[PDB]
Design a protein around this ligand. Sequence first.
Ligand SMILES: Cc1cc2nc3c(=O)[nH]c(=O)nc-3n(C[C@H](O)[C@H](O)[C@H](O)COP(=O)(O)OP(=O)(O)OC[C@H]3O[C@@H](n4cnc5c(N)ncnc54)[C@H](O)[C@@H]3O)c2cc1C
Ligand SMILES: Nc1ccccc1C(=O)CC(=O)O
Length: 367
Amino acid sequence: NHIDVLINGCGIGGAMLAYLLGRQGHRVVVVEQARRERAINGADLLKPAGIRVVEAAGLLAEVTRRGGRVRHELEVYHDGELLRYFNYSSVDARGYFILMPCESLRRLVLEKIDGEATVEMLFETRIEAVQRDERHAIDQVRLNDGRVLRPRVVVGADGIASYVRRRLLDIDVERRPYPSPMLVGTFALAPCVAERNRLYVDSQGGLAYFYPIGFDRARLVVSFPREEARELMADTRGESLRRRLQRFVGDESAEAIAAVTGTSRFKGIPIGYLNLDRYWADNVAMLGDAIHNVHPITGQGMNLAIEDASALADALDLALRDACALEDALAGYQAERFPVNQAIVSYGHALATSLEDRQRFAGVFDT
Ligand SMILES: Cc1cc2nc3c(=O)[nH]c(=O)nc-3n(C[C@H](O)[C@H](O)[C@H](O)COP(=O)(O)OP(=O)(O)OC[C@H]3O[C@@H](n4cnc5c(N)ncnc54)[C@H](O)[C@@H]3O)c2cc1C
Ligand SMILES: Nc1ccccc1C(=O)CC(=O)O
């Protein structure tokens, strides 16, 4: 019943890790509490560092074949006037980003895992209990199907409310909510949205970000102070939201506003602030939202899960092929990822708290 790696969670992070380890013939069991087909919804953005992972995994061609869109521009408006235009390819030819729904990319990765004979995905399954040895390493894990496994490594890829973090590592994280929630809705695609990503903010705390997703749809991500957000979502025919948008979204995006036909299909987006001091202990390591939570205004939640998965796959491959001890590989993982994750967590908070103040917001961008 010896395996190399037990991964708790089959989100984008855990799926990517499973796939990269499986490609090397490592014996992997992935435990996921949900059904495989549970349509989750998540982040839509891949940044250059995430794209590098997807490309190295051999998946980049397939991403655009399945509705992923290459982009290299963003317009940012404040109080209806253009504050910044960013052209990410204006120095770096490979500066581009990709818009790809998390669930589409995850389905692609699962299709690859289906072809890897050393990886076993267990859906509608959870860990029940673990047993530690005299060195304090997890050596036996019992699942709620009664299966017992003996993994060399246990990974928490189990997201924002990580079971591994809370129940195996005994970490409690301080909750510090933001006063403005964020919501995302999917609408018909207007030509203006097809043309260029446009982010709008105003001095009263409003945010509206319009961008295309898949072949023939568009997202609108909004943020308002909580009580206002409540009132705008309550008028379900969308008239209050559309008129609030018209206060800070100019006519370039008028057709995108008109596409907002109601509010009933908006979904909340979680908003945390976290970067754990330790990404690992003993033979247990964590990735993605289990270890950090970035403000979703950064767009980077999926991207950082993928970057972490790739780093952790590198570290675990070294340890499992006996190129170094596990504790040294896990320390190297943390050395590599902690600074990157820390910068984006700090930057997300700096963006979210500067929105209303035009000069400060611009200053956060310039870095
Ligand atoms: C609707 C929505 C919109 C979002 N939009 C944005 C955005 O605009 N910008 C942004 O930066 N981020 C956004 N996010 C956050 C982003 O998707 C996450 O950062 C990303 O999914 C993290 O990936 P992960 O693999 O670490 O965790 P997840 O994708 O959360 O995957 C974790 C997996 O673990 C499983 N799991 C949990 N507990 C257990 C258990 N006990 N046993 C077994 N399995 C378990 C879950 O079922 C899940 O499949 C959004 C999230 C949502 C839901
Ligand atoms: N990148 C962003 C910038 C401002 C507001 C929201 C987002 C996102 O929410 C993108 C995503 O869905 O990953």
